[PDB]
Amino acid sequence: HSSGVDLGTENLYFQSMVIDFKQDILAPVATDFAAMDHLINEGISSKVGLVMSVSKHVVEAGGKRMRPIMCLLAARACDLDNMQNAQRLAAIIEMLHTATLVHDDVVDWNNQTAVLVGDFLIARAFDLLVDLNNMTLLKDFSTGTCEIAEGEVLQLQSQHQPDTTEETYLKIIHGKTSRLFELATEGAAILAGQEAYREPLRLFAGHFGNAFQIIDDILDYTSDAETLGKNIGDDLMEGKPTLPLISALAHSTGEEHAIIRRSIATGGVDQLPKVIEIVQKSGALDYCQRRAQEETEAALQALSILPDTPYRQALINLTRLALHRI
Amino acid sequence: HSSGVDLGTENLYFQSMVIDFKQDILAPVATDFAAMDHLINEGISSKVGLVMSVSKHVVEAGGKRMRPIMCLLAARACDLDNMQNAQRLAAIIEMLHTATLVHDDVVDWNNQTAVLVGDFLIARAFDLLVDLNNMTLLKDFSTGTCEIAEGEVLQLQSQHQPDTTEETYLKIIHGKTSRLFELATEGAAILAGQEAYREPLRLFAGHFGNAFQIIDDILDYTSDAETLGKNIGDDLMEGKPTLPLISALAHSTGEEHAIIRRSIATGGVDQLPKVIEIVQKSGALDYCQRRAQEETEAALQALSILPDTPYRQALINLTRLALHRI
Ligand SMILES: [Cl-]
Ligand SMILES: [Cl-]
Ligand SMILES: [Cl-]
Ligand SMILES: [Cl-]
Ligand SMILES: [Cl-]
Ligand SMILES: [Cl-]
C-alpha cells in the first residue's frame, strides 16, 4: 500500500499550475469539512454574536482554510474510525488559527473586540480539546501552544535586529507557523492511535509550514504582496527578520550591506525602495526560493512513509500547490 | 471541628479595621506562598525576558495577590496532602489573572507586547494544568475560562446600554470576576478529592467575587477611585453598566433619570459631574453597599460548612477586609 514520493515524479504527470484546490485537495475530505462547519457554529456563535461575526469576517478575509483540511486529510490517511473526533479536532485547529489572526490584527471593530474575541476562541478550543478526553493530545497541544507563543515572542525580541541569524529565523517560524500544522496532522495520528505515523506526519507538516512561511516572506518583496493582504516593504517597516532580508545581508557587501543593516535597525521609509531593489537583485529571493523547495522536498519525503491513498495524494498536491505560489 | 460563621460574631471580637493582610490572611499559607514564587519563575521567565518583566511589572501594579493566596488557603482547609500541587494550581490562577489584566490593558511596552504576553501566560497556565493530570480539574477550568470570556463579551455587548438589568450585571460580574475565584477554591477541593467541600467553596468564592466587583464599582464613584488606579467617572466614560449606574436609574425619575440614561447611551463628558452627583445622592451607592454586605454574608455562610481551622479563619478575615474597603 505504501510507496516513494518524489517531486520530480509528480511533475512528470502533473504540472503544479494544473492543481485545483477544490478538486485535488479538499474533495477527499469534503463531506467531513462540511460537517466540521456545523460543529463550529455550535462551537461558538449562538451565545455571543460578536464572535461568530468576527470569526466569520476574519475567515472571510484571506486564504482557504488549509489547516483544518490538512487535519481531516491526515485523519483519513490514518484510517481514523471516529471521524467526528477528526472534525472536532479540525475545528480546534481552526479556532486557534483564527484566534492568532485576530490577535495579530491588534495595533499600537477594534483592539478590545479583537483581544476578547481571540481569548474566547482560545477558551472554546481548549474546552473542545478537553472533551476529546485524550491526555496525550492535550499535552501535545499544551506544549505546542507554548511553543507558538514562544515563537511569537522571539520574533518580537528579534525586531530591528540586523544580527539575527538564519538559525534564529527558522526557530521563529517553526514556532509561529509550523507548530500549528504539526498539531493538526500529528494530532490526527494521536486520535487514530497510529503512533508510527506521528513522527512522519509531524515532520511533514513542519517542513510544509517552514516552506509556507518562507514563501509568504518572499511575496512581501514582490508585486504579489497584495495576495497576502499586504503592501510591498511592510515587513521591513515593522523590522521583522524575514529570510529575504537576512539572505540579502549574506548576499551583499560594502554600502549595499550597510543600507540593509541600517534599514532593519531604524525602519525608516527613506531607503525602502533601495532596500527592496537590493533584495530583488542580490539573489536573496532566489536563495529563499531554493530553501522553500528544499523544505517542500523534506515534507514529501516524510509523507512517503504513509500508505498511498487519495488522502496522501491530497496532502502531496497541497504541498506542491503551496510551493507554486512562487 | 466545624462551626457556624457569623459576621456579627466576628465583629464582636474583631473590628474589620484591625484586620492586617500579612498576619491575618497570608500568614497561615506563608511558606506555601513563598514556594509558589520559585515555581512561577521556572514557570515563565528564563526563556523570554519580555514576559517575566511585564508579569513582574503588572504584578507590581495594584493589589495584593489574593487569588493565589485563596487557592492555597482552601487547599490547607481541605487538608490537601500534596501542597506542591496547590502551589502549582495557585501559580495557574495567578498567571490567568495576570493574563486578563495585561489583556484588559490593551487600548483602542504596547498593545502588541501586551497581547502576546497575555497569550504566553495563558499557554503556560494551561500546560501547567495538563501536568497536574486531573481531568475533573481540566474540565472545570476549560468550562470556567469559557464563562470568563463569555462574561467579558457580555460586558462589551452591554456597553452604552441604559436598559441593562441588574440580573444581567450579576451575570456579567460572575463571569468576569467571580468564576476565577471559584476555580481557585473549588480547584483546591478537586485536588484534595474533597467532593463535599467543592460546592461550599465554590459558593463562598462566587459570593466573595460578587461583593468584590460591587465594591470596585462603588469606589469609581468616590474619591478613593485612585486606589483602583482609576479616575472618578472612568467607568461612565467607557459606558460599562456598573450597579451604581443601574441603581441610580432605579433611584431616580424625571430629568435626573434622563440625564443618567443619556449619559450611559452617549458617554459624553459634559454631564459627567452631574451624573456622579446623582449617583452619590440618589442612594444608589448605599444600595450597592447593602448588596455587597449581603454577598459577604452569603460567602461566610457557605464557608461555615468547612471545619474551623486557621485556614478557614483566614478566608473569613479576607472577606471582611475586602468588605471594609467601603
Ligand atoms: Cl488555515
Ligand atoms: Cl481509529
Ligand atoms: Cl511541483
Ligand atoms: Cl489576585
Ligand atoms: Cl489530599
Ligand atoms: Cl465586618
XYZ file of C-alpha atoms and ligand atoms in Angstrom:
658
model
C 0.000 0.000 0.000
C 2.908 2.433 0.713
C 5.334 3.898 -1.873
C 8.020 6.552 -2.543
C 7.033 10.209 -3.050
C 9.050 12.298 -5.494
C 8.573 15.935 -6.560
C 10.108 15.141 -9.970
C 7.765 12.193 -10.468
C 4.704 14.284 -9.543
C 5.840 16.821 -12.161
C 6.114 14.132 -14.855
C 2.312 13.590 -14.743
C 1.013 16.731 -13.139
C 2.253 20.337 -13.518
C 1.626 22.365 -10.347
C -0.192 25.059 -12.341
C -2.844 22.342 -13.007
C -3.515 21.643 -9.305
C -7.038 22.803 -8.321
C -7.654 23.185 -4.570
C -11.339 22.167 -4.592
C -10.954 19.004 -6.711
C -7.390 17.893 -5.857
C -7.057 18.685 -2.145
C -10.438 19.333 -0.496
C -12.529 16.767 -2.429
C -11.464 13.649 -0.474
C -12.460 15.153 2.913
C -15.355 17.278 1.516
C -18.285 15.837 3.473
C -16.075 15.852 6.595
C -15.203 19.506 6.042
C -18.855 20.427 5.594
C -19.697 18.559 8.806
C -16.926 20.476 10.615
C -18.731 23.745 9.802
C -21.958 22.666 11.533
C -19.935 21.801 14.647
C -18.208 25.184 14.754
C -21.466 27.124 14.744
C -22.459 25.109 17.801
C -18.892 25.593 18.975
C -19.009 29.386 19.129
C -21.792 31.607 17.847
C -25.247 31.363 19.447
C -24.214 32.805 22.846
C -22.236 35.796 21.524
C -22.967 37.498 18.184
C -19.706 39.482 18.253
C -17.523 36.352 17.982
C -19.280 34.418 15.207
C -19.318 37.633 13.137
C -15.634 38.460 13.668
C -14.614 34.809 13.237
C -16.786 34.775 10.088
C -15.295 38.094 8.906
C -11.738 37.012 9.722
C -12.273 33.730 7.914
C -13.753 35.755 5.074
C -10.501 37.655 4.905
C -7.749 35.706 3.243
C -6.900 32.185 2.384
C -8.567 28.846 2.037
C -8.745 27.112 5.390
C -5.970 24.628 4.725
C -5.117 23.874 8.387
C -8.424 22.114 9.246
C -8.487 20.468 5.799
C -4.987 19.058 6.475
C -6.160 17.703 9.830
C -9.073 15.961 8.134
C -6.720 14.527 5.494
C -4.220 13.106 7.967
C -7.119 11.524 9.911
C -8.361 9.663 6.826
C -4.762 8.817 5.912
C -4.557 7.308 9.409
C -7.809 5.344 8.886
C -9.368 7.046 11.959
C -12.538 5.131 12.843
C -14.403 8.007 14.534
C -14.116 10.902 12.049
C -16.440 13.022 14.223
C -13.408 13.409 16.520
C -11.349 14.473 13.487
C -13.963 17.087 12.673
C -13.820 18.328 16.258
C -10.002 18.445 16.137
C -10.166 20.280 12.776
C -12.452 22.883 14.453
C -9.981 23.296 17.338
C -7.135 23.852 14.862
C -9.279 26.401 13.016
C -10.406 28.324 16.117
C -6.758 28.502 17.193
C -5.562 29.843 13.818
C -8.453 32.343 13.852
C -7.545 33.423 17.400
C -3.960 34.083 16.277
C -5.087 36.207 13.308
C -7.487 38.341 15.314
C -4.704 38.830 17.884
C -2.099 39.704 15.233
C -4.644 42.244 13.927
C -4.219 44.343 17.113
C -2.259 47.566 16.523
C -0.283 50.165 18.526
C -14.450 46.547 15.398
C -11.317 47.479 17.384
C -8.417 46.285 19.528
C -10.537 45.456 22.572
C -13.034 43.482 20.487
C -10.164 41.668 18.753
C -8.413 40.820 22.031
C -11.630 39.493 23.597
C -12.730 37.509 20.528
C -9.310 35.856 20.347
C -9.495 34.900 24.030
C -12.998 33.478 23.635
C -11.834 31.315 20.728
C -8.813 30.038 22.684
C -11.172 29.130 25.556
C -13.649 27.210 23.358
C -10.845 25.430 21.506
C -9.352 24.244 24.805
C -12.755 23.161 26.158
C -13.330 21.167 22.944
C -9.866 19.640 23.395
C -10.715 18.545 26.950
C -13.928 16.982 25.652
C -11.872 14.731 23.341
C -10.640 13.109 26.567
C -7.147 12.194 25.341
C -4.300 13.249 27.633
C -1.611 12.605 25.001
C -3.394 15.006 22.675
C -3.889 17.579 25.456
C -0.200 17.516 26.365
C 0.863 17.838 22.717
C -1.426 20.842 22.326
C -0.415 22.477 25.619
C 3.346 22.161 24.945
C 2.734 23.207 21.329
C 0.760 26.351 22.198
C 3.633 27.355 24.500
C 6.000 26.885 21.548
C 3.734 29.026 19.340
C 3.662 31.821 21.918
C 7.426 31.433 22.406
C 7.950 31.764 18.648
C 5.818 34.920 18.566
C 7.754 36.477 21.443
C 11.110 35.506 19.912
C 10.035 37.401 16.785
C 9.178 40.456 18.887
C 12.608 40.305 20.543
C 14.293 39.935 17.118
C 12.585 43.053 15.704
C 15.027 45.664 14.308
C 17.927 43.251 14.974
C 20.296 43.123 11.965
C 22.463 40.419 13.608
C 19.605 37.880 13.593
C 20.775 34.530 12.219
C 19.074 32.102 9.839
C 19.090 29.563 12.702
C 17.094 32.037 14.771
C 14.679 32.742 11.843
C 13.982 29.030 11.433
C 13.393 28.817 15.186
C 10.915 31.698 14.976
C 8.943 30.403 12.001
C 8.759 26.849 13.375
C 7.132 28.304 16.483
C 4.857 30.887 14.902
C 3.793 28.988 11.755
C 4.922 25.333 11.574
C 3.850 24.020 15.020
C 0.123 24.551 14.375
C 0.417 22.462 11.192
C 2.104 19.738 13.295
C -0.700 19.757 15.850
C -3.200 19.340 13.014
C -1.505 16.343 11.403
C 0.100 14.536 14.342
C -2.996 15.162 16.478
C -4.886 13.205 13.838
C -2.409 10.317 14.261
C -2.743 10.590 18.060
C -6.537 10.337 17.703
C -6.220 7.241 15.488
C -3.647 5.659 17.835
C -1.247 5.410 14.889
C 1.920 6.072 16.842
C 4.177 5.021 13.938
C 2.604 7.783 11.792
C 3.054 10.548 14.408
C 6.656 11.499 13.636
C 6.261 11.247 9.829
C 3.144 13.466 9.915
C 4.882 15.897 12.289
C 7.984 16.154 10.051
C 5.754 16.522 7.003
C 3.738 19.393 8.491
C 6.734 21.127 9.972
C 8.623 21.247 6.697
C 5.432 22.183 4.932
C 4.942 25.031 7.423
C 8.577 26.123 7.060
C 8.249 26.347 3.245
C 4.921 28.114 3.759
C 6.402 30.956 5.823
C 9.449 31.320 3.517
C 7.142 31.882 0.519
C 4.977 34.383 2.458
C 8.125 36.379 3.229
C 9.298 36.247 -0.386
C 5.916 37.522 -1.597
C 6.171 40.691 0.531
C 9.231 41.680 -1.559
C 7.377 41.188 -4.862
C 4.351 42.625 -6.709
C 2.184 39.768 -5.363
C 2.304 41.179 -1.794
C -1.414 42.124 -2.097
C -2.310 38.394 -2.228
C -1.304 38.253 1.470
C -3.297 41.450 2.182
C -0.038 43.416 2.464
C 1.867 46.167 0.681
C 5.445 45.722 -0.531
C 8.002 46.532 2.188
C 5.567 46.090 5.104
C 7.727 43.511 6.889
C 10.676 45.926 6.553
C 8.725 48.715 8.248
C 7.870 46.545 11.245
C 11.515 45.407 11.431
C 10.692 41.682 11.405
C 13.685 39.484 10.419
C 12.486 37.576 7.331
C 14.811 35.360 5.257
C 14.845 37.762 2.256
C 16.498 40.421 4.440
C 18.805 38.035 6.310
C 19.791 36.489 2.972
C 20.158 39.946 1.371
C 22.756 40.735 4.045
C 24.521 37.431 3.229
C 24.439 38.340 -0.486
C 25.794 41.892 -0.044
C 28.930 43.792 0.992
C 30.069 47.392 1.332
C 27.413 50.104 1.181
C 24.541 47.871 -0.003
C 25.156 45.760 3.101
C 25.167 48.915 5.259
C 21.887 50.174 3.765
C 20.038 46.916 4.531
C 21.544 46.783 8.029
C 20.656 50.381 8.921
C 17.223 49.889 7.357
C 16.498 46.914 9.650
C 17.819 48.777 12.712
C 15.963 52.071 12.061
C 12.938 51.045 9.958
C 12.747 54.385 8.115
C 10.892 54.783 4.807
C 13.677 56.739 3.054
C 15.843 53.807 1.861
C 12.902 51.429 1.496
C 12.875 51.453 -2.312
C 16.649 50.870 -2.385
C 16.392 48.003 0.098
C 13.660 46.296 -1.935
C 15.872 46.623 -5.028
C 18.897 45.070 -3.293
C 16.797 42.148 -2.010
C 15.457 41.583 -5.548
C 18.842 41.804 -7.344
C 21.262 40.341 -4.771
C 19.901 36.837 -5.384
C 18.438 36.746 -1.857
C 14.972 35.911 -3.192
C 16.389 33.026 -5.274
C 18.129 31.688 -2.168
C 14.819 31.808 -0.272
C 13.161 30.139 -3.226
C 15.632 27.237 -3.142
C 15.222 26.881 0.628
C 11.424 26.636 0.213
C 11.816 23.940 -2.454
C 14.167 22.016 -0.193
C 11.603 22.160 2.635
C 8.920 21.007 0.229
C 11.182 18.056 -0.678
C 11.714 17.183 3.005
C 7.927 17.391 3.551
C 7.161 14.928 0.740
C 9.853 12.517 1.878
C 8.383 12.335 5.399
C 4.948 11.710 3.842
C 6.229 8.789 1.730
C 6.178 6.592 4.857
C 2.363 6.618 4.791
C 0.266 4.311 2.611
C -0.536 5.576 -0.862
C -4.136 6.784 -0.516
C -6.151 9.621 -2.077
C -5.668 11.308 1.319
C -1.873 11.140 0.966
C -2.161 12.332 -2.648
C -4.206 15.327 -1.457
C -1.526 16.298 1.061
C 1.100 15.968 -1.682
C -0.973 18.083 -4.045
C -1.345 20.745 -1.338
C 2.401 20.950 -0.754
C 3.047 21.477 -4.481
C 0.194 23.985 -4.860
C 1.673 25.922 -1.915
C 5.125 25.904 -3.497
C 3.608 27.090 -6.810
C 2.714 30.482 -5.251
C 6.326 31.317 -6.281
C -14.258 20.587 64.237
C -16.848 22.572 62.179
C -18.956 25.528 63.418
C -21.241 28.433 62.396
C -19.764 31.590 60.828
C -21.390 34.926 61.620
C -20.399 38.444 60.508
C -21.887 39.884 63.721
C -19.933 37.430 65.863
C -16.663 38.234 64.057
C -17.351 41.920 64.780
C -17.868 41.240 68.500
C -14.177 40.234 68.859
C -12.543 41.754 65.836
C -13.283 45.090 64.101
C -12.522 44.916 60.366
C -10.288 47.997 60.601
C -7.991 45.786 62.768
C -7.566 43.070 60.106
C -3.964 43.015 58.785
C -3.453 41.168 55.481
C 0.065 39.860 56.210
C -0.647 38.487 59.711
C -4.357 37.568 59.475
C -4.731 36.204 55.937
C -1.363 35.378 54.343
C 0.448 34.068 57.456
C -1.094 30.561 57.518
C -0.045 29.787 53.909
C 3.158 31.928 54.006
C 5.793 29.275 53.296
C 3.481 27.844 50.605
C 3.118 31.268 49.003
C 6.874 31.794 49.010
C 7.335 28.367 47.411
C 4.769 29.303 44.733
C 7.019 32.203 43.667
C 10.005 29.933 42.956
C 7.763 27.760 40.767
C 6.492 30.707 38.733
C 9.974 31.879 37.795
C 10.571 28.398 36.412
C 7.054 28.612 35.025
C 7.661 31.628 32.798
C 10.761 33.799 32.743
C 14.088 32.258 31.686
C 13.117 31.692 28.020
C 11.604 35.143 27.381
C 12.684 38.298 29.242
C 9.711 40.318 27.954
C 7.149 38.182 29.828
C 8.746 37.902 33.278
C 9.289 41.688 33.216
C 5.727 42.556 32.169
C 4.255 39.928 34.511
C 6.528 41.362 37.235
C 5.534 44.941 36.316
C 1.836 44.065 36.096
C 2.007 42.302 39.440
C 3.852 45.346 40.736
C 0.887 47.428 39.693
C -2.029 47.110 42.046
C -3.297 44.804 44.678
C -2.070 42.035 46.886
C -2.255 38.727 45.068
C -5.303 37.419 46.888
C -6.393 34.880 44.229
C -3.383 32.523 44.623
C -3.398 33.075 48.403
C -7.078 32.000 48.483
C -6.227 28.872 46.494
C -3.503 27.999 48.986
C -5.916 28.594 51.881
C -8.677 26.383 50.514
C -6.091 23.624 49.892
C -4.982 23.644 53.538
C -8.621 23.927 54.623
C -9.161 20.774 52.545
C -6.177 19.024 54.199
C -4.533 18.513 50.764
C -1.679 16.034 51.218
C 0.479 17.214 48.292
C 0.673 21.009 48.739
C 3.166 21.241 45.850
C 0.122 20.682 43.605
C -1.657 23.509 45.454
C 1.308 25.765 44.784
C 1.186 24.815 41.111
C -2.576 25.480 40.994
C -2.038 28.830 42.776
C 0.500 29.739 40.030
C -2.009 28.802 37.304
C -4.655 31.005 38.940
C -2.124 33.842 39.146
C -0.879 33.555 35.547
C -4.512 33.583 34.408
C -5.386 36.714 36.421
C -2.196 38.369 35.122
C -3.095 37.408 31.538
C -6.515 39.044 31.962
C -5.001 42.287 33.296
C -2.425 42.614 30.541
C -5.219 41.955 28.023
C -7.580 44.485 29.638
C -4.674 46.962 29.416
C -4.946 46.976 25.586
C -6.441 50.208 24.211
C -8.138 51.492 21.025
C 5.546 48.395 26.198
C 2.485 48.471 23.905
C -0.630 46.681 22.670
C 1.240 44.033 20.684
C 3.538 43.240 23.612
C 0.527 43.087 25.945
C -1.450 40.803 23.621
C 1.499 38.422 23.184
C 2.451 38.350 26.879
C -1.145 37.540 27.809
C -1.235 34.688 25.286
C 2.065 33.279 26.543
C 0.743 33.267 30.113
C -2.495 31.529 29.074
C -0.391 28.880 27.286
C 1.898 28.197 30.276
C -1.039 28.130 32.691
C -2.806 25.521 30.547
C 0.370 23.434 30.159
C 0.805 23.504 33.960
C -2.844 22.453 34.293
C -2.289 19.470 31.980
C 0.741 18.484 34.054
C -1.499 18.186 37.142
C -3.061 15.226 35.311
C -6.592 15.612 36.698
C -9.365 15.581 34.094
C -12.007 16.865 36.531
C -9.834 19.893 37.204
C -9.117 20.400 33.485
C -12.816 20.328 32.617
C -13.681 22.756 35.428
C -11.004 25.141 34.178
C -11.922 24.790 30.493
C -15.662 25.398 31.079
C -14.775 28.183 33.528
C -12.441 30.025 31.141
C -15.247 29.950 28.556
C -17.535 31.512 31.176
C -14.922 34.198 31.914
C -14.587 35.055 28.225
C -18.386 34.960 27.884
C -18.711 37.385 30.802
C -16.183 39.744 29.205
C -18.011 39.681 25.873
C -21.401 40.173 27.550
C -19.963 43.323 29.141
C -18.797 44.555 25.733
C -22.280 43.962 24.303
C -23.861 45.780 27.288
C -21.705 48.902 26.802
C -23.725 52.141 26.417
C -26.940 50.170 27.085
C -29.184 52.044 29.562
C -31.751 49.196 29.610
C -29.252 46.743 31.145
C -30.796 44.906 34.098
C -29.334 44.008 37.491
C -29.797 40.336 36.519
C -27.579 40.960 33.508
C -24.977 42.846 35.646
C -24.757 39.932 38.074
C -24.352 37.597 35.097
C -21.511 39.757 33.772
C -19.608 40.084 37.041
C -19.947 36.377 37.878
C -18.269 35.636 34.553
C -15.613 38.336 34.525
C -14.683 38.382 38.237
C -16.273 35.627 40.369
C -15.521 32.497 38.276
C -11.734 32.802 38.667
C -12.173 32.889 42.459
C -14.285 29.706 42.155
C -11.607 27.936 40.133
C -9.071 28.839 42.821
C -11.079 27.492 45.755
C -13.024 24.588 44.250
C -9.960 23.512 42.251
C -8.239 23.120 45.607
C -11.088 20.837 46.758
C -10.873 18.911 43.463
C -7.134 18.404 44.051
C -7.766 17.129 47.597
C -10.616 14.865 46.421
C -12.908 16.610 48.912
C -16.037 16.486 46.795
C -18.294 17.528 49.701
C -16.287 20.783 50.016
C -16.475 21.663 46.290
C -19.888 23.344 46.260
C -19.377 25.198 49.580
C -16.002 26.564 48.402
C -17.499 27.472 45.011
C -20.449 29.332 46.604
C -18.070 31.032 49.023
C -15.756 32.301 46.274
C -18.555 33.298 43.961
C -20.280 35.461 46.541
C -16.927 36.791 47.616
C -16.166 37.684 43.986
C -19.610 39.260 43.537
C -19.103 41.517 46.596
C -15.595 42.247 45.322
C -16.772 43.631 41.971
C -19.650 45.609 43.564
C -17.171 47.431 45.836
C -14.776 48.127 42.923
C -17.664 49.752 41.050
C -18.699 51.803 44.081
C -15.133 53.079 44.514
C -15.055 54.536 40.979
C -17.873 56.909 42.044
C -15.969 58.094 45.136
C -12.709 59.902 45.995
C -10.991 56.523 46.548
C -11.068 55.719 42.794
C -7.249 56.176 42.671
C -6.845 53.066 44.885
C -8.007 51.031 41.849
C -5.643 53.001 39.563
C -8.624 54.888 38.108
C -10.079 58.387 37.988
C -13.633 59.163 39.100
C -16.169 58.656 36.288
C -13.930 56.356 34.207
C -16.480 53.530 34.068
C -19.070 56.088 32.890
C -16.840 57.183 30.012
C -16.398 53.625 28.759
C -20.165 53.066 29.090
C -19.838 49.911 31.211
C -23.051 49.045 33.130
C -21.990 49.033 36.802
C -24.501 48.667 39.662
C -24.100 52.310 40.823
C -25.476 53.500 37.467
C -28.149 50.805 37.144
C -29.195 51.515 40.737
C -29.041 55.292 40.134
C -31.618 54.798 37.371
C -33.767 52.768 39.812
C -33.417 55.564 42.398
C -34.312 58.415 40.006
C -37.211 59.814 37.966
C -37.880 62.732 35.641
C -34.888 64.696 34.368
C -32.288 63.141 36.705
C -33.298 59.766 35.272
C -32.981 61.162 31.729
C -29.508 62.595 32.403
C -28.134 59.251 33.647
C -29.783 57.399 30.754
C -28.467 59.744 28.052
C -25.068 59.756 29.762
C -24.832 55.945 29.535
C -26.019 55.951 25.904
C -23.722 58.775 24.692
C -20.776 58.701 27.130
C -20.076 62.443 26.817
C -18.053 64.362 29.419
C -20.485 67.307 29.680
C -22.968 65.844 32.212
C -20.352 63.706 33.951
C -20.170 65.835 37.104
C -23.982 65.891 37.337
C -24.203 62.125 36.874
C -21.639 61.492 39.619
C -23.664 63.766 41.921
C -26.933 61.924 41.219
C -25.288 58.536 41.858
C -23.893 59.859 45.165
C -27.145 61.481 46.399
C -29.838 59.169 44.976
C -28.925 56.451 47.483
C -27.628 54.228 44.662
C -24.251 53.828 46.372
C -25.950 52.798 49.646
C -27.973 50.204 47.737
C -24.755 48.817 46.227
C -23.212 48.867 49.674
C -26.044 46.760 51.116
C -25.835 44.322 48.196
C -22.089 43.853 48.828
C -22.725 43.169 52.526
C -25.396 40.642 51.620
C -22.950 38.854 49.292
C -20.348 38.890 52.038
C -22.940 37.266 54.338
C -23.728 34.575 51.740
C -19.972 33.946 51.323
C -19.423 33.381 55.055
C -22.451 31.122 55.340
C -21.159 28.827 52.573
C -17.777 28.726 54.351
C -19.345 27.666 57.676
C -19.708 24.119 56.298
C -15.923 23.677 56.490
C -14.061 22.716 59.665
C -12.962 25.576 61.882
C -9.251 25.904 61.068
C -6.820 28.837 60.872
C -7.214 28.403 57.095
C -10.981 28.958 57.330
C -10.395 31.905 59.684
C -8.023 33.437 57.115
C -10.652 33.189 54.376
C -13.186 34.784 56.734
C -10.761 37.561 57.607
C -10.151 38.198 53.895
C -13.859 38.533 53.147
C -14.280 41.119 55.926
C -11.110 43.015 54.964
C -12.438 43.168 51.383
C -15.798 44.482 52.570
C -14.006 47.096 54.726
C -12.739 48.902 51.585
C -16.166 50.632 51.834
Cl -5.917 27.773 7.647
Cl -9.145 4.572 14.668
Cl 5.976 20.975 -8.291
Cl -5.059 38.389 42.712
Cl -5.186 15.008 49.876
Cl -17.095 43.204 59.254
